[PDB]
Design a protein around this ligand. Structure first.
Ligand SMILES: Nc1cc(=O)[nH]c(=O)n1[C@@H]1O[C@H](COP(=O)(O)O)[C@@H](O)[C@H]1O
Ligand SMILES: Nc1cc(=O)[nH]c(=O)n1[C@@H]1O[C@H](COP(=O)(O)O)[C@@H](O)[C@H]1O
Lengths: 321, 330
């Protein structure tokens, strides 16, 4: 059924709220290319033994080839092959510690179409493993236009959820989280308080009747969730609250006690894991997803990086229990 | 004293084209699935008259992606290349619109959302569309409303300004204006780029944050506009012939007036004429600047869903130019 149910069931199976961010940059892909040479393509060889590699949509034949053969006979496909295999490696190494994976669209678009094929294969692979997914694309537009993102994200990729910037207004959510024609409902996290250094400029400095913009925005997002009856349908509108934004995390959790929060900003952005999880804590802890991207994906051994975040999260979750 | 194509800042490119064609029409190219399907059907019914005309154009030979496919005879596509049929008819639909309408366009605006919902195939089309517009030298806007943290948003900059070679893009600065340092500036190459930030949009509930939120008796959209310009100054964009401008809906007459009043020389991009029914005389009058290119009037479906887009475009060009004339003759 809904994302609410998928998250709950996965939390029951793995007992964490780690969200692993999969945001590969050019340097990471090139590094993977290089390491794999030095290592006799060990990680790619592992990827090929996994069963679900056989269920991805795009250029499967290419993906199943030996690296040595790709490099000589399918050179034009080398970037595709190593990019896709980088993502498969990270997933295969870390999925056992992940409540959910968040892929930031920005990392999949800058080479043109090739990265979108990779992104589709990444979502196919996670769907097959039944791991909850988030597309972080911060979508926003008028209703007629945004329906195309609903199609891309929820029908093409079959994502469970996405991120949305509702500064234009909340009506867009009607065309992102709801498909009237098909009677389908989808989940989204709206930007509330972000991690960038100048985030106060509009999110805090603007207000409406003694409340900061971020509170107004959170409240209006939940009002739209209500109008749509999302939770009735096991889907939700939640909040992106920065892991370096303790006061706001604390406020949001206090005043919206049962909201779903997605919290990026730990690791590469120096956010604080203990404070973030303590301030956003909920006993149904799928309601406080702690996103870790670069601190895992730019680590020579991502499994060990994932494991340590998993263990620390779990030790903090017990403290708060 | 002459600058070659591609070797000048967006400010200069817009002003030169405005001088040439004397309009502020921005043509929106937002093809939906029905548009592509309808094009395929109509071409099939008419022995591909419009595709055959596309294939005559010299610059189709200059686009980057799958020329081997694009330049095939249409009946060969249907028979021998069925897996490339959608790519071919989608790309030729966009080329057909461009070919029929470009002589009237100050700029074309492509909304990214229309090119993504089929996966990679639409991004190949979008790349070819931007390469084609670049060859024709027609000013471009990628309407993507991009936003993210600095490290992430750089990837959009690379896609939009290096891969597509767009002249400009739309940006949502609700996260903050620091992101503009990573969009309108590339520190590594020391290159500067142009953008339009969202100020007042056309959606029916746009007031809910843009007007309802305030700081010291100034509404959010005014604060956002000022902050964008402050960053533009800091970055020295206009000294490098680039700019940060504002998206202001064609239906937002009072907001357009305030913006032009308070920021007299700002660049405004105004969607909402045509399909969305905004008042053209009211918008163009409230947003008017004697340098026409500072009030771009976007028209999309009203042109692209018309059976005769060349004529539809000519009719909006003429209507706009008539209103420009009235504003110029006082
Ligand atoms: N959506 C976001 C809102 C935000 O405020 N900060 C942030 O980092 N993100 C995204 O989360 C991820 C953080 O990744 P990392 O800093 O763990 O690598 C990236 O995809 C960011 O673009
Ligand atoms: N960027 C926008 C901001 C906005 O407020 N309204 C709007 O319509 N747009 C875009 O302009 C175009 C309007 O096209 P049309 O209504 O003329 O077809 C579409 O790409 C919209 O997503």
């Amino acid at each position: 059924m809904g994302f609410k149910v998928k998250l709950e069931k996965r939390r029951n199976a793995i007992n964490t709220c780690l969200c692993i961010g999969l945001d590969p940059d050019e340097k990471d892909i090139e590094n993977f290319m290089k390491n794999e040479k030095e290592n006799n393509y060990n990680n790619i060889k592992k990827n090929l033994k996994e069963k679900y590699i056989n269920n991805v949509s795009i250029k499967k034949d290419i993906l199943l080839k030996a690296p040595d053969n790709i490099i000589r006979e399918e050179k034009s496909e080398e970037f595709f092959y190593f990019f896709n295999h980088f993502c498969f490696y990270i997933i295969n190494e870390t999925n056992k510690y992940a409540l959910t994976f968040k892929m930031n669209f920005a990392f999949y678009i800058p080479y043109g179409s090739v990265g979108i094929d990779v992104l589709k294969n990444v979502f196919d692979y996670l769907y097959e493993l039944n791991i909850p997914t988030i597309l972080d694309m911060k979508i926003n537009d008028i209703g007629n236009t945004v329906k195309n993102y609903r199609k891309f994200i929820f029908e093409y990729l079959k994502s469970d959820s996405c991120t949305v910037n509702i500064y234009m207004g909340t009506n867009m959510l009607k065309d992102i989280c709801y498909d009237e024609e098909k009677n389908k409902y989808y989940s989204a996290f709206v930007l509330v308080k972000t991690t960038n250094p100048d985030s106060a400029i509009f999110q805090k400095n603007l207000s409406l009747d003694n409340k900061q913009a971020y509170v107004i925005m959170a409240q209006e997002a939940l009002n739209m969730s209500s109008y749509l009856n999302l939770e009735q349908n096991n889907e939700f509108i939640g909040f992106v609250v920065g892991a370096n934004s303790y006061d706001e995390m604390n406020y949001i959790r206090t005043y919206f006690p049962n909201c779903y929060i997605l919290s990026p900003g730990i690791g590469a952005q120096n956010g604080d894991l203990h404070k973030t999880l303590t301030n956003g804590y909920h006993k149904s802890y799928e309601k406080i997803l702690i996103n870790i991207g670069r601190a895992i994906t730019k680590n020579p051994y991502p499994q060990k990086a994932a494991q340590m975040y998993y263990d620390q999260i779990n030790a903090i979750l017990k403290q708060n229990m």
